[PDB]
């Protein structure tokens, strides 16, 4: 909508420090460093490659609108997260124990804090049975 488009343009300008309508690696790196997270050159190049759907190495507002227009339904991330969890699930039946989740998830990848693990448990351990099933979690993830 008008409000959504205006907010998206404001965010893009926040990214687009120069104001020329073309975001480059330097601007994204600097703004996201100011956010707090320090990136790597390969990381910025990967973001550019994933977001550059034009063929010039820079992005404009229409591309950001098409990106953010993407919704949880059509990301087609189901099978990917499923295989990831099967790799996580030692048993392979499709259930993850609470203790194993607490030990592994918070101590690998993008490390998370105590509030993060608490909210994962809140929105995943609905039944509080320990052996958290993820298929329902990912189905509500898509929605």
């Amino acid at each position: 909508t008008e409000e959504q488009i205006a907010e998206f343009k404001e965010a893009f300008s926040l990214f687009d420090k120069d104001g020329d309508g073309t975001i480059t690696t330097k601007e994204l790196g600097t703004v996201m460093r100011s956010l707090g997270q320090n990136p790597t050159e390969a990381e910025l190049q990967d973001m550019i490659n994933e977001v550059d759907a034009d063929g010039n190495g820079t992005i404009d507002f229409p591309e950001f609108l098409t990106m953010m227009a993407r919704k949880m339904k059509d990301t087609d991330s189901e099978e990917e997260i499923r295989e990831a969890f099967r790799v996580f699930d030692k048993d392979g039946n499709g259930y993850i124990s609470a203790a194993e989740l607490r030990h592994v998830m918070t101590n690998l990848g993008e490390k998370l804090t105590d509030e993060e693990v608490d909210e994962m448990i809140r929105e995943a351990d609905i039944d509080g049975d320990g052996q958290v099933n993820y298929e329902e979690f990912v189905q509500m993830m898509t929605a």
Binding site: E41, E80, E83, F85, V87, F88, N93, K111, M141
Partner: protein
């Protein structure tokens, strides 16, 4: 006591469905059972042994249908482990699996026939043997290896076929007159196929000495060209086994998976919109890194890794160089 029942049920599911270790032994036993059926059925085709063969096969069919029914029930009961197969609808979907419906169909067919259907009996034995694959893994592996060596297999086939037709025609010319074996060209083709394959029944063989000379010269090559596909596929299978064995060691799917889950959750979890942007871009990055950890999954990545560090090394020393440049002015 749901805990112990769940434990026993998951053990039964592991032993019945895709097993890993000693469970194979049980399946082997079942295989033997069905295998016995096959042999007995074959013996049931002999008039001499028809009586005793069928007498034993009746009891053995009772045994095998009882075993298969018990296994089917234990399976649809132990299917409760899988989340998809939970409750009435989940278990009904489980029974919807093609191998499960095939199992129940063969069961009810055996029950009906037990209470002429010999052809049906043989086909159902074949089907309960086929079910053991249950995934097409054999077919998929064979197809993968064949496709990998498609060009080599096709060149072997083409050269072997040219050798077959040429040798058979030349021996036919050398033997069309003085050998009743090679009456027509079809007989010569049959001979050539049966020799270059090295089957060599002996029903047809050259007798004229020019024919024997041609047969020798052309067999010395045709036998090798006809044995080539077996060697090619065997070497391909062994090389694939070695590749998989060395690939299964590093297991670099853990950290990318953890990063992907973290990023997906965070992306689910003016300045706020820019933050959500950063997050969705990082989600795309997580998808990309997971995918790039899926497909290559090979030793060549190591080289790539080195290359990365290679370039990295350059970069870092440049910074170091820059530093010392300042020291020149200070």
């Amino acid at each position: 006591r749901n805990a112990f029942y769940r434990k026993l049920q998951n053990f039964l599911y592991n032993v019945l469905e895709r097993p890993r270790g000693w469970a194979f032994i049980y399946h082997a036993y079942v295989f033997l059972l069905v295998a016995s059926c096959l042999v007995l059925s074959v013996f049931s085709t002999i008039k001499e042994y028809e009586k005793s063969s069928e007498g034993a096969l009746y009891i053995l069919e009772i045994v095998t249908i009882v075993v298969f029914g018990v296994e089917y029930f234990v399976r649809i009961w132990a299917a409760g482990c899988c989340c998809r197969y939970r409750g009435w609808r989940g278990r009904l979907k489980f029974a919807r699996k093609p191998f499960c419906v095939i199992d129940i169909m063969v069961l009810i067919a055996s029950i009906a026939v037990l209470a002429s259907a010999l052809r049906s009996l043989r086909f159902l034995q074949i089907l309960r043997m086929i079910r053991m694959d249950r995934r097409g893994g054999t077919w998929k592996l064979l197809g993968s290896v064949v496709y990998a060596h498609s060009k080599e297999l096709v060149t072997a086939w083409y050269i072997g076929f040219l050798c077959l037709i040429l040798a058979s025609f030349l021996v036919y010319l050398a033997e069309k007159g003085e050998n009743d074996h090679f009456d027509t060209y079809a007989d010569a083709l049959w001979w050539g196929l049966i020799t270059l394959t090295t089957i060599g029944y002996g029903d047809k063989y050259p007798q004229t000495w020019n024919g024997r000379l041609l047969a020798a010269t052309f067999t010395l090559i045709g036998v090798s060209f006809f044995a080539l596909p077996a060697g090619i596929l065997g070497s391909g299978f062994a090389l694939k086994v070695q590749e998989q064995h060395r690939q299964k060691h590093f297991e670099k799917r853990r950290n990318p998976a953890a990063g992907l889950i973290q990023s997906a959750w965070r992306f689910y979890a003016g300045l706020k919109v820019s933050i959500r942007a950063v997050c969705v871009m990082r989600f795309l990055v997580s998808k990309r890194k997971f995918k790039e950890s899926l497909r290559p999954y090979d030793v060549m990545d190591v080289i790539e890794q080195y290359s990365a560090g290679h370039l990295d090394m350059l970069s870092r020393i440049k910074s170091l160089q820059s530093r010392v440049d300042q020291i020149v002015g200070r």
